Each structure stands twice: as C-alpha cells, then as structure tokens.
C-alpha cells in the first residue's frame, strides 16, 4: 500500500528553486546530510545513557557513505535515531515551513544556497544532485518506512520490504545524469575531508 | 543543600586549556552559547507537536541577551527544553567528555579554538570570558537548579530559589574585569550580525 502526500505550497517551491536555481557549488548537499545523520546518532546516544535498551536494535553509531555506478545511487547510511511515520508525514513538515521561509527570504536578501542548513532544511539540498530521494528509516518505536519524492509537489510513504536495517535511515540519492562526479571514489573523499572532517562518529566510504 | 561535583580529568582540562591558551577571538563565545539556545528551543518545539502540553509552561520561543555593568554579567536567556538534574550531574559529562577528547586532537594537529562547537562542547567557550559562569535551568519534568562552576575542577548544582523560569536555561556569565566589552550595547550588536543573524528566534538585546 503507497500512501502520496501533498506537500505544503512551502515546501515545493523550495524544492522546485533547489532544482530551478543555477547554483555551481553542488556539493554542499552532502556536508548537509551528513550532518543530518551525525545529529540523529547524538540524539540516540543522548537518549540511551537515560534508557540503555533503546540500543538493543544497535550499538554501533555511524556513517557509511555508498555509491553504486550501476543503480547511479550514492546512499548515506545511519545507525541514528531514525524517523517514526508521523516524522515524515507531520511533523518534519511542520517544522520545515518556517524554516523554509526563513530561508527564502534570507535568498532575497543576497544569502547563498550553501547556507540552508542554518534554516534546518538542508535535507533539500539533496535535489542539486539528485532527481530523486528515497529514505529508508527505522525508528524504535515504529516499523520500517520508505519515504519517496521526486519533487513535483508529493511524497509517497509506505511499509518498507526490503532488507530490515534493525534502528536508523538511509538517504538513497537518485543521481542527475550530469552528476555522477558523486559517484567516485576521490571526489566523494574530497568532499568530506573539505567539509565533514570532524563529525564525531566514523564515515566510511564503500568502494565500489 | 549545594552538592560539588568534580569534573572528570578530561573536561577539568579542556577548561584549563581555554583559560590558559592565549587567543584573541574570544567574541565566538557569544555564537556558541546563542547556537545551544537555538537547539534547546528546537527541541522543546519539536518534542510539543506530538505532546502540546509540553508548552502549558511557557508558549513564547525566544532568546534574550541580558547585559548587567554593575553586576558585570552577560545572561543569555532562552525558553528551550532547559536541562534535569541527571543532565547537570551525569548526562553532559559523559557526552562531553569525547568531544573534549576530539577537540584536543583537532587543536594539537592545527584547528582552532573557533571550532570548538564541531565537538559538541562549544558552552566551554564561556570560559574565555567569564571568570565563573552560573546556569539556572528549569526542565518540564524536574525542578528548577543552579548550577555553578569557576572551573578549578569543581562544579555545584542546588536546587535554585530565585525567580521561577516557568521552562528554560539562563547561561549568567560573570566577564573577567578585562573583558567588560561585552556588556556593552554595540559590541554585542556586532557579534550577533556577525555570528547568529540567522537564528530562527527573536533575540532580544536588553539595554542597561
Ligand atoms: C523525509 C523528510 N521529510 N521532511 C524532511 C525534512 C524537513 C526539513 C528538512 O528535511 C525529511 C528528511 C529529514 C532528514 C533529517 N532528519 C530529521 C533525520 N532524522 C533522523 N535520522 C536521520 N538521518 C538523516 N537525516 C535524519
Ligand atoms: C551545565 C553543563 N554541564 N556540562 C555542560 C556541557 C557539556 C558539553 C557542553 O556543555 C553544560 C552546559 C550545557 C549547555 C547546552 N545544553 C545542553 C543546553 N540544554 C538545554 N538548554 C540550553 N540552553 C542553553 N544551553 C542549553
């Protein structure tokens, strides 16, 4: 059962000027997921030091950074907190319309696209790169979701069936056709020692 | 009743090493501790949509900066989360304890004291100007706490007295007698457009 979700008129027309804006500087879009995925490994590290058992679907706390040239994926993985069905049905969206105006209005005011993050929207910057996102999330107090947007204005969630991934999320960026530089090895590398070289948990870079 | 605390070896030493270092930038204090205010309020808004009540003890989000010259205190207020008495005594040390550890590595091998805030443990930096710094917190699900520290290895936590807070932290920071600058209107202006222009909360900059 595929569930689709309108998003807020907020929101799309963020999305649609993340795909419509000529902006050189693409990379940034990772810098921002990884730093999505090391504040969800904080928030159940935090957590579990009051409730040790919220690490019984996984101990271990980090980031690995997959590509595939044959899918032309680059996935980020997580062993983070992961996202409940009213995460990304509600409450992300909720909290993503301030941040997008915000933003949009910083835009106006002569900002840069590599700010997003300072507005707690920079998942979006995913769309540089990629024509479509799919997250794959498990959070402990819920079962394992499929989020899917390929913009145009909806969403689609659903019960994942795939390879159950005990507590966190995946990020599977859908690349543009022009953009599988994110694809290699040394530029993937030259990305995260520029812009994520201090995040606290391990990044590892799958090799193809 | 005041219970003293010592820190552990680690956070007793990064204290040390941010009074000792001599560094001249010591204006980033302010971004850090408006920064935690940030995500202090983030969190106590992102925790109320799926439990309103959580906000029965105050709806208004916002920061003030609260500037005292005959106290010769700087208090940067917010209506965030605010902290337990188990965060005080127990949970932040041990977070803290290896962002110290990797913010020791990254200093030895050439980062800079700026970068304090990638390790998690950016509050410290209060300890560039302050000579002791006194944190009131008041958290949903606890009672309202001082705590205290003039580094030395010790900190104190009571239950606090003064004004109720209704829900939040106030960060009171008592300035070295060489660093009175920061008490002063234009001077904290200055910072907060250089640093914080795009935090997504009213910050009010109280006059004297
Ligand atoms: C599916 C969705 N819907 N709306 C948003 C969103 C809203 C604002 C920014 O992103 C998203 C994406 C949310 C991404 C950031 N986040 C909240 C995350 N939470 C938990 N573990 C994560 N590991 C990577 N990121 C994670
Ligand atoms: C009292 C104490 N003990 N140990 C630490 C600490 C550990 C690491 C960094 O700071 C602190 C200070 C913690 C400061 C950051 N924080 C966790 C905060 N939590 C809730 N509302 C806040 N409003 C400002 N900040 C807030």
């Known amino acids: 059962e595929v569930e689709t979700f309108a998003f807020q008129a907020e929101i799309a027309q963020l999305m649609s000027l993340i795909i419509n804006t000529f902006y050189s500087n693409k990379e940034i879009f990772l810098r921002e997921l990884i730093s ?15 409730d040790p058992s919220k690490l019984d679907s996984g101990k271990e706390l980090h980031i690995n950074l997959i590509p595939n040239k044959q899918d032309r994926t680059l996935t980020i993985v997580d062993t983070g907190i992961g996202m409940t069905k009213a995460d990304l049905i509600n409450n992300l969206g909720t909290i993503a319309k301030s941040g997008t105006k915000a933003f949009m209005e910083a835009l106006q005011a002569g900002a840069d696209i ?27 107090d819920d079962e394992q979701y ?9 969403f689609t969630v659903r019960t ?26 040394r530029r993937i590398k030259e990305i995260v020692k520029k812009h994520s070289q201090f995040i606290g948990y391990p990044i590892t870079l799958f090799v193809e």
């Open 114 to 140: 590599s700010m997003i993050g300072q507005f707690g929207v920079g998942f979006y910057s995913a769309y540089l790169v990629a024509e479509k996102v799919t997250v794959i999330t498990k959070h402990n």
């Open 146 to 154: 499929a989020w899917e947007s390929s913009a145009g204005g909806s």
């Open 36 to 50: 999505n995925s090391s504040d969800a490994l904080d928030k159940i590290r935090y957590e579990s030091l009051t």
């Open 160 to 185: 994942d069936t795939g390879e159950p991934m005990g507590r966190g999320t995946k990020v599977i960026l859908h690349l543009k056709e022009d953009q599988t530089e994110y694809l290699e090895e």
